Design a protein around this ligand. Structure first.
Ligand SMILES: [Ca+2]
Ligand SMILES: [Ca+2]
Lengths: 347, 108
């Protein structure tokens, strides 16, 4: 009957709008956010130890660049230099040897990580993640670096990037950070014989290859982003297939066997998109558990001269809880969606 | 204690070969490089090696006669008068602290 069909349509559409447009109540949004915060947490946890500044074309370059971070305390990462045995800074360090896979990042590769990190961080701070069915809003991200001048001074530059807080843009930034590490596998700095405290994974003696130390972690973070991107794509497929209620229920010229079969198949596409989104959202939770169960187990989920390098400081545990709570709400509504499919299938 | 270079032999005949041996090489290294002359200078790079890579990278001062080993030794074969003077080794340790040493040999 038309009463029953309109009920099933209203169930689908109400559930879809929460899923596509909700924040706190949408596991799609919470999964996407979890992936973004996880990548920020990854970089806050181990990014400081990444060796950078290997030369690209020529060792005559003698290139150095400094990259600026702010918690509210500020820190600075040098790429290219080293420290002399007496403690003074040397302009000849990692830049004396060639940048490539399993060695170090180039200055160009590091500045891409750094920029993506500042965009992602500042977007989430200034605007939050936009709803997944939204265009998002424009915002300005600031990226601060410095360079050494002829003999004397250090010149600091603050760049302004016009960017947005939509999921697709932010997932792209996260993907840049993860793929740079996973594809170029830079070496990590060892503990000595800008972090105050030393995490357990950063041992004295020999340095470790980042893909050896964090192979499982990088793969988990990469899968989180890829599944989040698919959530975003399914959410737009959901926003396309929005079935209409039957008006004029008794009018068989308006409501034909053709138009009602098209409606029924639109209802099924909506429901199948919803199911796939929730499955992806559960896979993101599974991948977060992979990410947070190895070397980063006592680090990624926590936050406390002084700086927060070595800890995640990204609110991942809070988001995980909100993912679980919202996912359970949608899972409890599965019976009213199964009957809505069974209602559509008979047509 | 400190990184030092030994030339072998101390004085070399023209056409012959010389080995720059390294004493007190630190145990935990990121990489190292050899330079022609008395200064660390990319323009005078003979060859650099990164730990874990299996293959060294030559620089502008490379002449086809130099072999680096993973004890940081540098062998120079078919020596001439142009090879007179200083050679510099820089080492980058795993914590990004560097050490530097100078070698030399006479030629006749
Ligand atoms: Ca930090
Ligand atoms: Ca190795």
């Amino acid at each position: 009957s038309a009463q029953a069909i309109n009920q099933a349509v209203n169930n689908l559409n109400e559930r879809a709008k929460t899923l596509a447009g909700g924040t706190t109540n949408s596991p799609a949004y919470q999964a996407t956010l979890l992936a973004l915060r996880s990548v920020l947490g990854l970089w806050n946890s181990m990014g400081y130890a990444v060796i950078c500044g290997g030369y690209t074309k020529s060792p005559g370059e003698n290139n150095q660049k400094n990259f600026h971070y702010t918690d509210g305390n500020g820190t600075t990462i040098n790429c290219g230099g080293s420290t002399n045995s007496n403690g003074t800074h040397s302009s000849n360090g990692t830049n004396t040897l060639k940048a490539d896979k399993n060695v170090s990042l180039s200055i160009e590769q590091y500045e891409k990580i750094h920029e993506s990190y500042q965009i992602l961080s500042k977007a989430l701070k200034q605007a939050g993640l936009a709803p997944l069915n939204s265009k998002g809003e424009k915002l300005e991200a600031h990226v601060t670096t410095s360079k050494y001048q002829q003999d004397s001074q250090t010149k600091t530059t603050t760049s302004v990037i016009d960017t947005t807080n939509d999921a697709q843009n932010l997932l792209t930034q996260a993907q840049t950070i993860v793929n740079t590490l996973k594809d170029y596998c830079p070496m990590l700095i060892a503990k000595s014989s800008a972090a105050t405290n030393t995490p357990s994974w950063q041992t004295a003696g020999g340095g470790k290859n980042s893909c050896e130390t964090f192979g499982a972690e990088f793969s988990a973070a990469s899968d989180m982003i890829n599944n989040a991107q698919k959530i975003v794509q399914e959410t737009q497929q959901l926003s396309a297939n929005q079935p209409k209620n039957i008006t004029q229920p008794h009018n068989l010229n308006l409501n034909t066997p053709s138009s009602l079969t098209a409606l029924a198949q639109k209802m099924l596409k909506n429901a199948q998109s919803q199911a796939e989104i929730l499955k992806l959202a559960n896979q993101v939770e599974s991948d977060f558990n992979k990410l947070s169960s190895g070397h980063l187990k006592d680090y990624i989920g926590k936050c406390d001269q002084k700086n927060n390098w070595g800890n995640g400081c990204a609110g991942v545990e809070e988001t995980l809880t909100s993912l679980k709570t919202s996912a359970a709400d949608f899972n409890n509504q599965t019976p009213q969606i199964n009957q809505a499919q069974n209602l559509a299938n008979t047509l | 204690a400190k990184l030092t270079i030994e030339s072998m032999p101390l004085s070399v005949a023209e056409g012959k070969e010389v080995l720059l041996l390294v004493h007190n090489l630190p145990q935990h290294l990121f990489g190292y490089s050899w330079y022609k002359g008395e200064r660390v200078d990319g323009n005078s790079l003979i060859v650099g090696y990164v730990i874990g890579t299996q293959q060294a990278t030559p620089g502008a001062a490379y002449s086809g006669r130099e072999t680096i080993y993973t004890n940081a030794s540098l062998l120079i074969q078919n020596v001439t008068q142009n090879d007179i003077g200083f050679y510099t080794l820089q080492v980058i340790k795993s914590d990004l602290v560097n050490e530097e040493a100078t070698g030399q040999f006479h030629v006749y």
